[PDB]
Amino acid sequence: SNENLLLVHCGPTLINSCISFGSE
Amino acid sequence: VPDTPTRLVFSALGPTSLRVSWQEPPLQGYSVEYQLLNGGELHRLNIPNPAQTSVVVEDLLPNHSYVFRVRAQSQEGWGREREGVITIESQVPLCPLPGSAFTLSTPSAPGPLVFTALSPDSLQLSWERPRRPNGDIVGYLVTCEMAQGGGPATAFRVDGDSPESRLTVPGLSENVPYKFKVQARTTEGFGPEREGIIRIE
C-alpha cells in the first residue's frame, strides 16, 4: 500500500494514483 | 477456456516503468502483452505461476501511449484478454510530492488526483476531465473509505461536465489513511477508475 501524506496549508498536491479497468 | 481477467490495474513507478496487476475470478499462468499504440513491436511476458498476478514493466518511453493486454491460460487454451491503454507523462508549483514528476494517464480516465488538505478533518479533491470519454460525461462518482478496511464507504455524486471538477470531503478522522476512487459516469456507462490513498498530517 502507498499512502500520500498531505500537509495542512501546503496547497494543492498531486499524488500518485493507480488506474483500474474493470471492477474490484 | 479461462475467464477474462476481471480487473487490470496500473501504477507508475517512475517516468519509464510501471506495475501492471490483475485479478482472475486451475491455470498454467498468464500472458501480458504490450506495445506502442501505433506500430510498436509486440512484447509478451509469460507469467508461469497462477499465484503471481503483478509484474513490473521497465524501459517504457515517456509520453508514449502503450496498449496492454492480459490473458489467462489453462489446459483448455487461452482466455479472452482484458486491455488498457496507458501513458506515463513527464516533463520534456504544487506541493512537491515524491513521484509528482510523473503521472499515469489513459484517455477515458479522470485526470491525476490533486488534493488540498484544508484542515485536520477535511480536504478538497480535484481532477481534470477525461480527455476522451466514451460518450458525454454526466458526472463523477467519488468514493472515500478507510484504507485499512472495516468501515463503510462514502459515495459522492459530482454532477456536470466541468473541465476541472472539485469535491470537498469533510468528517475525516485525524491522521487516518483514506482511499479515494474517482470514475466518470458517461452516457455509455462508467469509465476507468483512478484511485489513491491519502493521510492528512
Strand B122-128 relative to strand B102-105, pairing: unpaired
Task: Tell me whether B144 touches chain A (CB under 8 Å).
Answer: no
Q: Determine contact, residues B113/B196, Cβ cutoff 8 Å.
A: yes
Which of B148, B156, B151, B155 is CA-nearest to residue B179?
Answer: B148
Chain B window 97-136: which residues touch A at a Cβ cutoff of 8 Å?
A: 97, 99-100, 103-106, 109, 112-120, 123, 126
Residue B112 has its nearest CB partner, among A2, A7, A17, at A17
Strand B164-169 relative to strand A13-14, pairing: unpaired
Provide the 8-state DSSP code for B78.
Answer: E
Q: What share of chain A is helix, strand, coil (3-state, %, to 5)?
A: 0, 45, 55
Distance in Å, alpha carbon of A1 to nearest chain B alpha carbon: 8
SS3 B44: strand
Which of B188, B179, B185 is CA-nearest to residue B165?
Answer: B185
Q: Determine contact, residues B180/B196, Cβ cutoff 8 Å.
A: yes
Domains and CATH numbers, chain B: 1-96 (2.60.40.10), 97-201 (2.60.40.10)
CA pair distance B73, B58, nearest whole angstrom: 24
| B122 Cβ contact list (under 8 Å, min separation 6) | B168, B169, B170, B171, B172
Looking at the DSSP assignment, which residues form a beta bridge with residue A20? Answer: B9, B193
Buried b (16+ CB within 10 A) or exposed e, B44-58: eeebeebeebeeebe
Cell numbers found for residue B62:
515517456
Distance in Å, alpha carbon of A7 to nearest chain B alpha carbon: 5
